[PDB]
Amino acid sequence: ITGTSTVGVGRGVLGDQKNINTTYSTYYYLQDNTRGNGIFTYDAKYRTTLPGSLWADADNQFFASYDAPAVDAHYYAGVTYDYYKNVHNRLSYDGNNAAIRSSVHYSQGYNNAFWNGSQMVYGDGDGQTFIPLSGGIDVVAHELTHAVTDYTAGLIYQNESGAINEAISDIFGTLVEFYANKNPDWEIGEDVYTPGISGDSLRSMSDPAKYGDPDHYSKRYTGTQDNGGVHINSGIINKAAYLISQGGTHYGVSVVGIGRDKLGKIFYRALTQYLTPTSNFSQLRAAAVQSATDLYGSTSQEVASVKQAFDAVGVK
Numbered sequence: 228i229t230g231t232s233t234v235g236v237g238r239g240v241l242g243d244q245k246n247i248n249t250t251y252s253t254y255y256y257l258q259d260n261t262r263g264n265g266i267f268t269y270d271a272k273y274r275t276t277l278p279g280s281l282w283a284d285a286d287n288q289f290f291a292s293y294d295a296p297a298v299d300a301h302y303y304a305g306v307t308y309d310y311y312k313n314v315h316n317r318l319s320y321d322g323n324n325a326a327i328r329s330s331v332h333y334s335q336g337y338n339n340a341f342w343n344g345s346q347m348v349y350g351d352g353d354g355q356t357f358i359p360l361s362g363g364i365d366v367v368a369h370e371l372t373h374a375v376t377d378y379t380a381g382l383i384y385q386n387e388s389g390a391i392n393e394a395i396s397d398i399f400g401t402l403v404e405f406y407a408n409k410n411p412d413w414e415i416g417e418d419v420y421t422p423g424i425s426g427d428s429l430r431s432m433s434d435p436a437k438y439g440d441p442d443h444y445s446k447r448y449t450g451t452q453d454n455g456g457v458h459i460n461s462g463i464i465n466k467a468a469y470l471i472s473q474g475g476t477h478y479g480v481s482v483v484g485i486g487r488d489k490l491g492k493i494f495y496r497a498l499t500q501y502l503t504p505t506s507n508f509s510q511l512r513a514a515a516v517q518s519a520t521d522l523y524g525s526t527s528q529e530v531a532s533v534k535q536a537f538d539a540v541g542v543k
Protein backbone atom coordinates (compact mmCIF):
# COMPACT_ATOMS: atom_id res chain seq x y z
CA ILE A 228 0.00 0.00 0.00
CA THR A 229 0.99 3.64 -0.45
CA GLY A 230 1.64 5.30 2.87
CA THR A 231 4.41 6.49 5.16
CA SER A 232 6.96 4.31 6.90
CA THR A 233 6.43 3.88 10.62
CA VAL A 234 7.82 1.80 13.51
CA GLY A 235 5.52 -0.29 15.64
CA VAL A 236 6.20 -2.45 18.66
CA GLY A 237 4.92 -5.85 19.67
CA ARG A 238 5.63 -9.25 21.15
CA GLY A 239 6.60 -12.38 19.27
CA VAL A 240 5.61 -16.02 19.77
CA LEU A 241 8.13 -16.51 22.60
CA GLY A 242 7.01 -13.35 24.45
CA ASP A 243 9.91 -11.11 23.47
CA GLN A 244 9.34 -7.47 22.61
CA LYS A 245 10.60 -6.16 19.30
CA ASN A 246 10.20 -3.13 17.05
CA ILE A 247 8.77 -3.71 13.56
CA ASN A 248 8.75 -1.64 10.40
CA THR A 249 5.17 -0.80 9.43
CA THR A 250 3.35 1.51 7.01
CA TYR A 251 0.64 3.99 7.96
CA SER A 252 -2.32 4.68 5.69
CA THR A 253 -5.47 4.87 7.88
CA TYR A 254 -4.35 1.59 9.47
CA TYR A 255 -0.85 0.47 10.36
CA TYR A 256 0.16 -2.36 8.03
CA LEU A 257 2.86 -5.01 8.34
CA GLN A 258 4.69 -3.53 5.38
CA ASP A 259 8.41 -2.79 5.84
CA ASN A 260 9.59 -0.30 3.23
CA THR A 261 13.17 -0.20 4.54
CA ARG A 262 14.28 -3.37 2.76
CA GLY A 263 14.21 -3.77 -1.00
CA ASN A 264 10.79 -3.46 -2.54
CA GLY A 265 9.22 -4.27 0.80
CA ILE A 266 8.44 -7.06 3.25
CA PHE A 267 4.71 -7.72 3.53
CA THR A 268 2.97 -9.91 6.12
CA TYR A 269 -0.57 -11.23 5.66
CA ASP A 270 -3.32 -12.79 7.82
CA ALA A 271 -4.59 -16.10 6.42
CA LYS A 272 -7.25 -16.13 9.21
CA TYR A 273 -7.08 -19.91 9.81
CA ARG A 274 -7.96 -20.59 6.17
CA THR A 275 -6.00 -21.96 3.23
CA THR A 276 -6.67 -19.19 0.70
CA LEU A 277 -3.45 -17.28 0.05
CA PRO A 278 -2.15 -14.76 0.72
CA GLY A 279 -5.09 -13.55 2.78
CA SER A 280 -5.27 -9.90 3.79
CA LEU A 281 -2.31 -7.57 4.35
CA TRP A 282 -2.01 -7.34 8.10
CA ALA A 283 -3.78 -4.21 9.38
CA ASP A 284 -3.68 -2.88 12.94
CA ALA A 285 -5.39 0.19 14.40
CA ASP A 286 -2.68 1.44 16.77
CA ASN A 287 0.77 0.15 15.68
CA GLN A 288 1.04 -1.99 18.84
CA PHE A 289 1.15 -5.74 18.31
CA PHE A 290 0.84 -7.34 21.77
CA ALA A 291 -2.25 -9.50 21.25
CA SER A 292 -1.72 -13.24 21.23
CA TYR A 293 -3.14 -13.35 17.68
CA ASP A 294 -0.48 -10.81 16.61
CA ALA A 295 2.55 -12.81 17.78
CA PRO A 296 3.10 -15.04 14.71
CA ALA A 297 2.82 -12.03 12.43
CA VAL A 298 5.33 -10.00 14.46
CA ASP A 299 7.93 -12.76 14.18
CA ALA A 300 7.31 -13.65 10.51
CA HIS A 301 7.70 -9.98 9.63
CA TYR A 302 10.74 -9.31 11.86
CA TYR A 303 12.63 -12.49 11.00
CA ALA A 304 12.05 -11.98 7.27
CA GLY A 305 13.83 -8.64 7.80
CA VAL A 306 16.75 -10.31 9.58
CA THR A 307 17.03 -12.86 6.78
CA TYR A 308 16.98 -10.11 4.15
CA ASP A 309 19.75 -8.36 6.08
CA TYR A 310 21.85 -11.53 6.21
CA TYR A 311 21.68 -12.08 2.46
CA LYS A 312 22.35 -8.42 1.66
CA ASN A 313 25.11 -7.75 4.21
CA VAL A 314 26.88 -11.13 4.06
CA HIS A 315 26.40 -12.22 0.42
CA ASN A 316 25.57 -8.96 -1.37
CA ARG A 317 22.27 -10.52 -2.48
CA LEU A 318 19.20 -8.27 -2.71
CA SER A 319 16.18 -10.37 -1.71
CA TYR A 320 15.54 -13.87 -3.01
CA ASP A 321 15.75 -12.98 -6.73
CA GLY A 322 18.78 -10.70 -6.41
CA ASN A 323 16.65 -7.77 -7.61
CA ASN A 324 14.88 -6.80 -4.40
CA ALA A 325 11.67 -8.74 -5.03
CA ALA A 326 8.97 -8.06 -2.45
CA ILE A 327 8.99 -10.67 0.30
CA ARG A 328 5.52 -11.89 1.30
CA SER A 329 4.50 -14.15 4.20
CA SER A 330 1.14 -15.38 5.49
CA VAL A 331 0.57 -16.49 9.08
CA HIS A 332 -2.36 -18.25 10.72
CA TYR A 333 -2.46 -20.65 7.79
CA SER A 334 -5.07 -23.39 8.23
CA GLN A 335 -5.89 -25.02 11.60
CA GLY A 336 -3.50 -27.17 13.63
CA TYR A 337 -0.98 -26.92 10.79
CA ASN A 338 2.39 -28.34 11.86
CA ASN A 339 4.50 -26.95 9.04
CA ALA A 340 5.72 -23.96 7.05
CA PHE A 341 6.55 -23.70 3.36
CA TRP A 342 7.40 -21.57 0.36
CA ASN A 343 4.57 -22.05 -2.13
CA GLY A 344 6.49 -20.85 -5.20
CA SER A 345 5.63 -17.19 -4.51
CA GLN A 346 5.47 -16.55 -0.75
CA MET A 347 6.17 -17.96 2.71
CA VAL A 348 3.37 -19.67 4.65
CA TYR A 349 3.31 -20.49 8.38
CA GLY A 350 1.00 -22.71 10.35
CA ASP A 351 0.16 -22.10 13.98
CA GLY A 352 0.92 -25.71 14.90
CA ASP A 353 -1.39 -27.82 17.06
CA GLY A 354 0.19 -26.65 20.32
CA GLN A 355 1.76 -30.07 20.90
CA THR A 356 4.09 -30.80 17.97
CA PHE A 357 4.60 -27.08 17.14
CA ILE A 358 3.69 -23.62 18.33
CA PRO A 359 3.39 -20.97 15.60
CA LEU A 360 6.28 -21.74 13.35
CA SER A 361 7.41 -18.19 12.55
CA GLY A 362 8.70 -18.08 16.13
CA GLY A 363 11.82 -19.86 14.89
CA ILE A 364 14.34 -17.64 13.15
CA ASP A 365 15.93 -20.72 11.60
CA VAL A 366 12.49 -21.73 10.29
CA VAL A 367 11.83 -18.34 8.69
CA ALA A 368 15.27 -18.29 7.11
CA HIS A 369 14.83 -21.93 5.98
CA GLU A 370 11.66 -20.88 4.15
CA LEU A 371 13.10 -17.78 2.50
CA THR A 372 16.13 -19.81 1.47
CA HIS A 373 13.85 -22.11 -0.56
CA ALA A 374 13.01 -19.01 -2.64
CA VAL A 375 16.74 -18.26 -3.06
CA THR A 376 17.37 -21.84 -4.16
CA ASP A 377 14.47 -21.76 -6.59
CA TYR A 378 15.77 -18.59 -8.25
CA THR A 379 19.38 -19.84 -8.43
CA ALA A 380 20.34 -23.52 -8.61
CA GLY A 381 16.70 -24.55 -8.98
CA LEU A 382 17.23 -27.91 -7.26
CA ILE A 383 14.30 -30.19 -8.05
CA TYR A 384 12.47 -31.20 -4.87
CA GLN A 385 13.04 -34.96 -4.96
CA ASN A 386 15.76 -37.52 -4.28
CA GLU A 387 19.33 -36.24 -3.96
CA SER A 388 18.73 -32.84 -5.54
CA GLY A 389 15.83 -32.34 -3.13
CA ALA A 390 17.92 -33.38 -0.13
CA ILE A 391 20.53 -30.80 -1.19
CA ASN A 392 17.69 -28.25 -1.50
CA GLU A 393 16.62 -29.08 2.07
CA ALA A 394 20.16 -28.96 3.44
CA ILE A 395 20.76 -25.55 1.82
CA SER A 396 17.69 -24.27 3.67
CA ASP A 397 18.88 -25.79 6.99
CA ILE A 398 22.43 -24.46 6.48
CA PHE A 399 21.36 -20.90 5.76
CA GLY A 400 18.59 -21.07 8.33
CA THR A 401 21.29 -21.88 10.87
CA LEU A 402 23.70 -19.25 9.57
CA VAL A 403 20.95 -16.63 9.90
CA GLU A 404 20.29 -17.84 13.44
CA PHE A 405 23.99 -17.32 14.21
CA TYR A 406 23.92 -13.91 12.47
CA ALA A 407 21.16 -12.72 14.80
CA ASN A 408 23.12 -14.28 17.68
CA LYS A 409 20.22 -15.21 19.97
CA ASN A 410 20.64 -18.71 21.39
CA PRO A 411 22.29 -19.98 18.18
CA ASP A 412 22.85 -23.68 17.60
CA TRP A 413 23.16 -26.31 14.87
CA GLU A 414 19.64 -27.66 15.53
CA ILE A 415 16.54 -26.91 13.43
CA GLY A 416 13.28 -25.58 14.85
CA GLU A 417 14.07 -25.93 18.56
CA ASP A 418 12.33 -22.65 19.47
CA VAL A 419 8.93 -23.77 18.18
CA TYR A 420 9.03 -27.58 18.36
CA THR A 421 7.32 -29.63 21.10
CA PRO A 422 6.66 -27.05 23.82
CA GLY A 423 6.22 -29.89 26.31
CA ILE A 424 9.68 -31.42 25.69
CA SER A 425 12.83 -29.42 26.44
CA GLY A 426 16.10 -29.83 24.58
CA ASP A 427 14.84 -31.41 21.35
CA SER A 428 14.42 -30.15 17.80
CA LEU A 429 13.12 -31.28 14.43
CA ARG A 430 16.59 -32.06 13.01
CA SER A 431 20.19 -31.79 14.17
CA MET A 432 22.99 -30.80 11.79
CA SER A 433 25.72 -31.69 14.29
CA ASP A 434 24.31 -35.17 14.91
CA PRO A 435 21.50 -35.95 12.45
CA ALA A 436 21.19 -39.45 13.85
CA LYS A 437 19.88 -38.02 17.16
CA TYR A 438 16.51 -37.76 15.37
CA GLY A 439 16.94 -40.78 13.09
CA ASP A 440 18.38 -39.04 10.04
CA PRO A 441 21.44 -40.43 8.23
CA ASP A 442 24.91 -39.06 8.79
CA HIS A 443 26.66 -41.10 6.09
CA TYR A 444 25.80 -41.85 2.46
CA SER A 445 25.70 -45.60 3.23
CA LYS A 446 22.68 -44.92 5.48
CA ARG A 447 20.70 -42.92 2.90
CA TYR A 448 17.00 -43.54 2.46
CA THR A 449 16.09 -44.93 -0.94
CA GLY A 450 12.28 -45.20 -0.71
CA THR A 451 9.56 -42.89 -1.94
CA GLN A 452 8.22 -41.23 1.22
CA ASP A 453 8.93 -37.52 1.68
CA ASN A 454 9.72 -37.00 -2.05
CA GLY A 455 12.46 -39.60 -1.78
CA GLY A 456 13.61 -38.58 1.69
CA VAL A 457 14.37 -34.90 1.13
CA HIS A 458 14.06 -34.09 4.88
CA ILE A 459 15.88 -37.34 5.80
CA ASN A 460 18.86 -37.47 3.44
CA SER A 461 19.46 -33.78 4.10
CA GLY A 462 21.21 -35.09 7.23
CA ILE A 463 24.14 -36.31 5.14
CA ILE A 464 24.78 -32.85 3.70
CA ASN A 465 23.96 -31.06 6.96
CA LYS A 466 26.58 -33.20 8.69
CA ALA A 467 29.15 -32.35 5.99
CA ALA A 468 28.39 -28.63 6.41
CA TYR A 469 28.66 -28.87 10.20
CA LEU A 470 32.02 -30.63 9.85
CA ILE A 471 33.35 -28.03 7.40
CA SER A 472 32.50 -25.27 9.86
CA GLN A 473 33.18 -26.83 13.26
CA GLY A 474 35.44 -29.80 12.51
CA GLY A 475 35.40 -33.24 14.07
CA THR A 476 36.30 -36.85 13.46
CA HIS A 477 33.37 -38.78 12.03
CA TYR A 478 33.51 -42.48 11.17
CA GLY A 479 37.24 -42.15 11.69
CA VAL A 480 37.76 -39.29 9.19
CA SER A 481 39.13 -36.07 10.70
CA VAL A 482 38.00 -32.65 9.48
CA VAL A 483 39.65 -29.38 10.45
CA GLY A 484 36.93 -26.76 10.90
CA ILE A 485 37.16 -23.47 9.00
CA GLY A 486 34.27 -21.63 10.69
CA ARG A 487 30.75 -20.54 9.82
CA ASP A 488 31.61 -17.54 7.68
CA LYS A 489 33.72 -19.58 5.26
CA LEU A 490 31.10 -22.36 5.24
CA GLY A 491 28.54 -19.78 4.19
CA LYS A 492 30.77 -18.30 1.49
CA ILE A 493 31.55 -21.73 0.01
CA PHE A 494 27.95 -22.94 -0.02
CA TYR A 495 26.56 -19.63 -1.26
CA ARG A 496 28.98 -19.70 -4.20
CA ALA A 497 28.20 -23.36 -4.88
CA LEU A 498 24.46 -22.64 -4.84
CA THR A 499 24.64 -19.60 -7.10
CA GLN A 500 27.45 -20.51 -9.52
CA TYR A 501 27.73 -24.29 -9.85
CA LEU A 502 24.68 -26.31 -8.79
CA THR A 503 21.97 -27.14 -11.31
CA PRO A 504 18.41 -28.39 -10.90
CA THR A 505 19.44 -32.03 -11.05
CA SER A 506 22.71 -31.94 -9.06
CA ASN A 507 23.35 -35.02 -6.95
CA PHE A 508 25.49 -35.32 -3.81
CA SER A 509 28.69 -36.09 -5.74
CA GLN A 510 28.07 -33.01 -7.89
CA LEU A 511 27.54 -30.92 -4.75
CA ARG A 512 30.93 -32.09 -3.48
CA ALA A 513 32.50 -31.00 -6.76
CA ALA A 514 30.72 -27.63 -6.62
CA ALA A 515 31.87 -27.03 -3.03
CA VAL A 516 35.46 -28.00 -3.87
CA GLN A 517 35.46 -25.66 -6.86
CA SER A 518 33.87 -22.86 -4.83
CA ALA A 519 36.46 -23.19 -2.06
CA THR A 520 39.19 -23.24 -4.69
CA ASP A 521 37.86 -19.99 -6.23
CA LEU A 522 37.69 -18.27 -2.84
CA TYR A 523 40.77 -19.62 -1.02
CA GLY A 524 43.07 -21.39 -3.50
CA SER A 525 43.68 -24.99 -4.52
CA THR A 526 46.26 -25.67 -1.80
CA SER A 527 44.24 -24.03 0.97
CA GLN A 528 43.08 -25.58 4.21
CA GLU A 529 39.55 -24.63 3.16
CA VAL A 530 39.66 -26.90 0.10
CA ALA A 531 41.26 -29.70 2.09
CA SER A 532 38.52 -29.50 4.73
CA VAL A 533 35.72 -29.57 2.17
CA LYS A 534 37.18 -32.81 0.81
CA GLN A 535 37.61 -34.34 4.28
CA ALA A 536 34.03 -33.46 5.25
CA PHE A 537 32.53 -35.10 2.17
CA ASP A 538 34.80 -38.11 2.67
CA ALA A 539 33.60 -38.33 6.29
CA VAL A 540 29.97 -38.62 5.12
CA GLY A 541 30.78 -41.06 2.32
CA VAL A 542 30.24 -38.74 -0.67
CA LYS A 543 32.85 -39.05 -3.42
Ligand SMILES: CC(C)C[C@H](NP(=O)(O)CNC(=O)OCc1ccccc1)C(=O)NCCN
Nearest residue numbers: 339340341342343344366369370384416429458
Ligand atom coordinates in the same frame (compact mmCIF):
# COMPACT_ATOMS: atom_id res chain seq x y z
C1 LIG B 1 11.94 -25.94 9.07
C2 LIG B 1 10.68 -26.75 9.34
C3 LIG B 1 10.03 -26.32 10.65
C4 LIG B 1 9.68 -26.64 8.19
C5 LIG B 1 10.12 -27.35 6.92
N1 LIG B 1 9.14 -27.10 5.86
P1 LIG B 1 9.59 -27.06 4.27
O1 LIG B 1 10.80 -27.96 4.10
O2 LIG B 1 9.88 -25.69 3.74
C6 LIG B 1 8.17 -27.76 3.37
N2 LIG B 1 8.25 -27.38 1.98
C7 LIG B 1 7.75 -28.17 0.94
O3 LIG B 1 7.16 -29.18 1.10
O4 LIG B 1 8.02 -27.55 -0.27
C8 LIG B 1 7.44 -28.11 -1.42
C9 LIG B 1 6.34 -27.20 -1.95
C10 LIG B 1 6.43 -26.62 -3.24
C11 LIG B 1 5.40 -25.79 -3.70
C12 LIG B 1 4.28 -25.55 -2.92
C13 LIG B 1 4.23 -26.11 -1.65
C14 LIG B 1 5.23 -26.91 -1.17
C15 LIG B 1 10.32 -28.83 7.21
O5 LIG B 1 11.35 -29.31 7.57
N3 LIG B 1 9.15 -29.57 7.03
C16 LIG B 1 9.09 -30.99 7.32
C17 LIG B 1 8.34 -31.11 8.66
N4 LIG B 1 8.27 -32.46 9.18
Ligand SMILES: [Ca+2]
Nearest residue numbers: 284286288289
Ligand atom coordinates in the same frame (compact mmCIF):
# COMPACT_ATOMS: atom_id res chain seq x y z
CA1 LIG C 1 -2.83 -3.19 17.90
Ligand SMILES: [Ca+2]
Nearest residue numbers: 410411412417
Ligand atom coordinates in the same frame (compact mmCIF):
# COMPACT_ATOMS: atom_id res chain seq x y z
CA1 LIG D 1 18.55 -21.62 18.78
Ligand SMILES: [Ca+2]
Nearest residue numbers: 365414415416
Ligand atom coordinates in the same frame (compact mmCIF):
# COMPACT_ATOMS: atom_id res chain seq x y z
CA1 LIG E 1 18.32 -23.57 15.51
Ligand SMILES: [Ca+2]
Nearest residue numbers: 420421422424
Ligand atom coordinates in the same frame (compact mmCIF):
# COMPACT_ATOMS: atom_id res chain seq x y z
CA1 LIG F 1 10.67 -28.94 22.38
Ligand SMILES: [Zn+2]
Nearest residue numbers: 369373393396
Ligand atom coordinates in the same frame (compact mmCIF):
# COMPACT_ATOMS: atom_id res chain seq x y z
ZN1 LIG G 1 12.46 -27.07 3.53
